[PDB]
Design a protein around this ligand. Structure first.
Ligand SMILES: Cc1cc2nc3c(=O)[nH]c(=O)nc-3n(C[C@H](O)[C@H](O)[C@H](O)COP(=O)(O)OP(=O)(O)OC[C@@H]3O[C@@H](n4cnc5c(N)ncnc54)[C@H](O)[C@@H]3O)c2cc1C
Ligand SMILES: Cc1cc2nc3c(=O)[nH]c(=O)nc-3n(C[C@H](O)[C@H](O)[C@H](O)COP(=O)(O)OP(=O)(O)OC[C@@H]3O[C@@H](n4cnc5c(N)ncnc54)[C@H](O)[C@@H]3O)c2cc1C
Ligand code: PRO
Ligand code: PRO
Lengths: 468, 468
């Protein structure tokens, strides 16, 4: 292994106290930036939570809930009475006065809950919905749903669907290019049967030609093509496929190759070192999507079943936040080698990146990204003209495309993300949680914990090492 | 009285069978137009009701509500189970498994329900919220809340507030003119103490100088100034004030004077004849807002208490719809004399006007109008580029401005409008009412009734003549 590859391998499951301790100073926002990040986060979160005055309206209630000392069911009864009285037109009059059931229930609940996250059933239908937000400065990346191909036929169907999508998106793009125009994202698990346990030689012989073919096609249309990151035990093979791809003669001089890295992995900073080296050696700018990570629940369960030395991911959410900030700094440092794409729905994460990116923004410096159905509310404050009170930073929406038959795995990941009490999108709905706690700085949070617990970066109390 | 004024007076309370019979053929859409109106209405209503697939989602439910023959509380219990099961991260595991209380209650319920209809507490705050929709082709008219001045001081305060608003809107308009730029609306009841019973000589001596002053000021900024229509027994005096205003030398050649007429009045078509004559004599194009009418409940109660020969308004909602269509045709016929502004939230009314207005639309031919908090959803399909799937017709939003202390009377009118089972905005929420019934043609509805009941335009069965 190369120096940078060896360093990745060695960091696979290193102890959390150690990993978190190393990240801390790399993630720390310089005091001035910290404060600007705080103010911007607070404001973003305020406008988002209180768009329709959901807090000021709670305040008006409690103001009467005390002046009369009434209960919940009490105050409501009064409002109904007041409503009925307001429907009196004249003021004077008002004044004077088996298993299939279960199998189907799950299918239906998935489809009902899933609609909000799907852009369209077909690529043409998704493209049709693009202009509305593209006219406002948003960009799109299309995500053909369907993964973990089980058969050769499965993988073939996915391959054909991706090709068709690229032709369609590429015709829609119409020369707009990899930054300003739409792109596509692909899952390697979709292109090779039984990817989860696939061996190196079969992946190269079979998966790679498909990856190359799609990438050449994307390049012909000059659209971005991004490789999604999946389970942690596929990181290594994904790097081998990326390595090989970046040295294809037909791809020389083209900067449309994109790759996701997951901040919840202890390996993330080390993967960045490798990528910086790869960009240098292959003479290109890589489009790098920095994400926190979508498979956390399964990663913990997987590690606990394999009874290994440790976890490949962090066990406290705040450590993932710290990792993301440290990694973001590393990416922003090398604008000649990387085009960073900062995927987040978290107002603080967004504000911190906005500040870390420094003065003198230019369009091709970086972009934000979000998931359809989750990020638009927040990024409506961000993408757009400064005169209209926006930040004038581009956001690319990831737009799932497919029918109910391909929706399951993606939906479950969205359920987990939205429903977790640690998630920003969950906590911002909790009007009992003060904005300041919601946008609290992750580094300072970690230092608080370290003081209270006796050392930095201890694992989650409820998540012991697999061997315990 | 002039011929046209005499004809108004004589129509004040004419029998509904007679009034409705006269309107019917004036309102009838020529067969071809009728069908295009139907298709457009249907489509507008479909997109509005089913924006987030609220009907297709009901269809998916009932499809299982039968395949298992489960009740409402039953199906829900299943969805919760299916939701909990979808939160299992791994598929294998999932598979294997006193009076102040009342006085305050009314105040609070008003403010809570009222927020959705108010644009801002102050004119500057309302103006600040303009760009978002003005950038999309919407226009605004600002409605300083507060009416029925009881004292001389009250009316003075309203006068001062209107003046300040005109300066602010006029500075915001910045030369955009009466069609493309924002304007203001005023209530005469706000400018004169105890307007409801005010005598002709005192109104002219006191109200008129204030009306003139505001209109001259509006003209200096070249912004529209619209006179709201209020209770029916103030129609006559409002016409006298308008008559006088239109002959002011300082207003000669200026077409920014606006005036509301209420289609639910039997007098409406006759008022149009008068207005057409007034525009001719005073040598101007009048901005005429055709509305159905906001005071129906009070009008019925007022007439029943005065025990007069009949009602000044129709007693069936469908007759008001017919009156509006007939009046709309009359207005569209005289583009040199009137700039018609068609206020409606009703998809059929809108579609019918769109068709009646004929081929070869030009911006200054007419506009649509709506109330803030009620019309934007519908007009998002209407105002905008044809390429984006819109109708490319302008809509002017009426935007209430003021604090909770001025909100009461307006809110009650909105409660009545929204809550009435006869209102389009109520029925469109009723997913059990088929789109075709919702957008049913009013003339054909009236003819159906006439066949079933034995004659055309009979009063509402539940609303006898006041003397019964
Ligand atoms: C355009 C786009 C593309 C994406 N592509 C991928 C992809 O290819 N692969 C993928 O894995 N994800 C991908 N993601 C999504 C992603 O990783 C999640 O949306 C994300 O982790 C949420 O981060 P957040 O800052 O919005 O929310 P935040 O609420 O700030 O953080 C949320 C989360 O932190 C983590 N976490 C939660 N609990 C813990 C814990 N106890 N210990 C340690 N970490 C914890 C998680 O990673 C998690 O989702 C993509 C997202 C977008 C917007
Ligand atoms: C910009 C703007 C300015 C306005 N200015 C005024 C104004 O100065 N004065 C004013 O009075 N209104 C005014 N209105 C509002 C108005 O009159 C109501 O919003 C309106 O009547 C609703 O009509 P619609 O076509 O949207 O709804 P629809 O549901 O199609 O019709 C609604 C209604 O029909 C009528 N109605 C209801 N029941 C009956 C019945 N049993 N018999 C006969 N008629 C019935 C009513 O007039 C009523 O509101 C204005 C509205 C707007 C948008
Ligand atoms: O599949 C997922 O969950 C993430 C989110 C978009 C694609 N990668
Ligand atoms: O006051 C009302 O109710 C109507 C609606 C806007 C102004 N005239």
């Amino acid at each position: 292994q190369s120096v940078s590859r060896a360093a990745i391998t060695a960091a696979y499951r290193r102890p959390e106290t150690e990993a978190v301790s190393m990240l801390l100073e790399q993630a720390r926002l310089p005091q001035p930036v910290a404060e600007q990040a705080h103010k911007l986060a607070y404001q973003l979160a305020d406008k988002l939570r209180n768009q329709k005055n959901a807090s000021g309206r709670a305040g008006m209630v409690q103001g009467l809930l005390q002046e009369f000392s009434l209960s919940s069911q009490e105050g409501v009864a009064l409002m109904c009475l007041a409503e009925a009285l307001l429907r009196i037109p004249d003021k004077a009059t008002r004044d004077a006065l088996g298993e299939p059931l279960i199998r189907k229930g799950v299918d239906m609940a998935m489809r009902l809950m899933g609609e909000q996250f799907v852009t369209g059933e077909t690529i043409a239908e998704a493209l049709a919905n693009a202009r509305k937000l593209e006219e406002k400065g948003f960009r799109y990346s299309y995500d053909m749903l369907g993964e973990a191909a089980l058969t050769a036929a499965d993988a073939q169907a996915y391959m054909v669907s991706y090709q068709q999508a690229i032709h369609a998106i590429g015709k829609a793009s119409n020369g707009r290019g990899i930054y300003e125009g739409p792109g596509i994202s692909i899952k390697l698990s979709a292109l090779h049967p039984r990817y989860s346990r696939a061996q190196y030689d079969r992946v190269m012989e079979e998966l790679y030609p498909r990856l190359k073919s799609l990438t050449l096609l994307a390049r012909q249309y000059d659209i971005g093509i991004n490789i999604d990151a999946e389970e942690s035990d596929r990181l290594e093979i994904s790097l081998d496929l990326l390595e090989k791809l970046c040295f294809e003669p037909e791809l020389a001089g083209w900067n449309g190759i994109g790759f996701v890295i997951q901040a919840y992995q202890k390996r993330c900073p080390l993967v960045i070192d490798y990528l910086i080296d790869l960009a240098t050696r292959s003479r290109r700018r890589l489009m790098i999507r920095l994400v926190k990570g979508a498979y956390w629940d399964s990663e913990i369960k997987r590690a606990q079943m394999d009874g290994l030395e440790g976890y490949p991911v962090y066990t406290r959410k705040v450590y993932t936040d710290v990792s993301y900030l440290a990694c973001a700094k590393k990416l922003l440092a090398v604008p000649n080698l990387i085009y960073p794409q900062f995927a987040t729905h978290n107002a603080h994460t967004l504000a911190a990146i906005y500040q870390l990116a420094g003065q003198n923004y230019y369009p091709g410096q970086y972009e934000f990204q979000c998931l359809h159905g989750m990020g638009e509310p927040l990024y409506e404050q961000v993408t757009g003209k400064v005169a209209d009170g926006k930040l004038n930073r581009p956001c690319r929406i990831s737009a799932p495309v497919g029918t109910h038959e391909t929706l399951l795995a993606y939906l479950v990941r969205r359920l987990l993300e939205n429903g977790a009490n640690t998630s920003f999108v969950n906590r911002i709905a909790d009007t009992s949680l003060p904005l300041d706690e919601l946008v609290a700085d992750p580094v300072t949070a970690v230092e608080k914990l370290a003081q209270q617990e006796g050392q930095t970066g201890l694992p989650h109390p409820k998540i012991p090492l697999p061997r315990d």
